[PDB]
Amino acid sequence: SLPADILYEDQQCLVFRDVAPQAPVHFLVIPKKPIPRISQAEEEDQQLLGHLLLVAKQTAKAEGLGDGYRLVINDGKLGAQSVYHLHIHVLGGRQLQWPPG
Amino acid sequence: APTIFSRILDKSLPADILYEDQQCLVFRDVAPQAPVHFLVIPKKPIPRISQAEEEDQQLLGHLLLVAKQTAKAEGLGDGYRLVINDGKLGAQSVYHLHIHVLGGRQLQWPPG
Ligand SMILES: Nc1ncnc2c1ncn2[C@@H]1O[C@H](CO)[C@@H](O)[C@H]1O
Numbered sequence: 001s002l003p004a005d006i007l008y009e010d011q012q013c014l015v016f017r018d019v020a021p022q023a024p025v026h027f028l029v030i031p032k033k034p035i036p037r038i039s040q041a042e043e044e045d046q047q048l049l050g051h052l053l054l055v056a057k058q059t060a061k062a063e064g065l066g067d068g069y070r071l072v073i074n075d076g077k078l079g080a081q082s083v084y085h086l087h088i089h090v091l092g093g094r095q096l097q098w099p100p101g
Numbered sequence: 102a103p104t105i106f107s108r109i110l111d112k113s114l115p116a117d118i119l120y121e122d123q124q125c126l127v128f129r130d131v132a133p134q135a136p137v138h139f140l141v142i143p144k145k146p147i148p149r150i151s152q153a154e155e156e157d158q159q160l161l162g163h164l165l166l167v168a169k170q171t172a173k174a175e176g177l178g179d180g181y182r183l184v185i186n187d188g189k190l191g192a193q194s195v196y197h198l199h200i201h202v203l204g205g206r207q208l209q210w211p212p213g
């Protein structure tokens with residue numbers, strides 16, 4: 001993993017490639033505020049959460065995902081959350097299946 | 102009207118509604134992929150997340166907070182998954198923005 005694997009950074013968030021990718025494009029959007037899980041976000045996080053989704057879709061465009069993609073947020077053990085910090089997964093570059101896990 | 106979600110919003114198609122306010126509507130998915138499977142949609146007919154814009158920032162955050170609030174109400178304390186599909190490769194199918202909330206079983210990886 002190299003510095004260029006950070007695709008985007010601002011005062012609110014970091015975007016970086018997943019080193020265990022599940023699709024030809026697979027990156028991760030995280031807040032800099034250490035919200036551990038989406039179930040523990042609060043009303044004060046409204047604007048931040050909206051920003052994370054906008055950054056996810058902006059980065060998807062930058063990564064050439066013009067034919068579609070999937071955003072995923074995992075909560076807790078049943079969601080298969082792998083790190084207790086909020087992550088938005090963005091997957092693209094192949095046909096995504098249904099159900100989504 | 103662009104999609105069947107327009108009928109859910111105007112109540113001409115009866116749906117199992119879990120939450121409603123002036124910005125969004127939450128209802129059960131009629132082809133559920135998990136023991137709990139519901140959709141959070143804006144009343145503003147944004148067709149796809151790739152077509153959301155900066156003016157939608159507040160709305161988008163609100164949709165996520167409503168998703169997690171409703172997940173709690175539905176008893177998803179041991180975990181759940183939120184999914185937003187964009188376009189054909191995302192398997193979106195209905196072109197009105199919606200967040201899937203799935204819980205009540207172990208979710209697998211990869212997520213499709
Ligand atoms: N009339 C409906 N009521 C609730 N969910 C629906 C309806 N039509 C489609 N969906 C769901 O919306 C998603 C996009 O097609 C799928 O999960 C699908 O089952």
Ligand SMILES: [Cl-]
Binds near residue numbers: 081
């Ligand atoms: Cl995760």
